[PDB]
Nanobody, 126 residues
Framework: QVQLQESGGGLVQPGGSLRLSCAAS????????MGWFRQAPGKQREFVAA????????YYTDSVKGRFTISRDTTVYLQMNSLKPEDTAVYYC???????????????????????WGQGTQVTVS
């Protein structure tokens, strides 16, 4: 099990850039994955990006591909470039230990596929 804490939240102006961080406390192995989800006003919690801690497989939702980069250092980062007002949302860090039979180069995208969650942090592009 891991405990998760986001940082880097806050305001940024349109056309700027912002980096979120999430520090994981606990054992970060055995098909361990981390992800970012976000929830905009009036919307569901949506998948943003995820990463496999071993091997480095990543996947991005279509609307952020090429603009956002997810990476490792203990800590996962979401580097957010060319920010638009529509990127405004509460961003949540998530993590999970995938089942033993999982492909080593695969990631789930549904919120309930991730067992561990941060409290979320507001990002406002305005």
């Amino acid at each position: 099990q891991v405990q998760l804490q986001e940082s880097g939240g806050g305001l940024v102006q349109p056309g700027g850039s912002l980096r979120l961080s999430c520090a994981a406390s606990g054992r970060t192995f055995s098909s361990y994955a981390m992800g970012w989800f976000r929830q905009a006003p009036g919307k569901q919690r949506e998948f943003v990006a995820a990463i496999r801690w071993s091997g480095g497989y990543t996947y991005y939702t279509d609307s952020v591909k090429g603009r956002f980069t997810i990476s490792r250092d203990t800590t996962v980062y979401l580097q957010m470039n060319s920010l638009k007002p529509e990127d405004t949302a509460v961003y949540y860090c998530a993590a999970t230990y995938l089942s033993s039979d999982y492909s080593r180069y695969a990631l789930p995208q549904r919120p309930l596929d991730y067992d561990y969650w941060g409290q979320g942090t507001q990002v406002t592009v305005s």
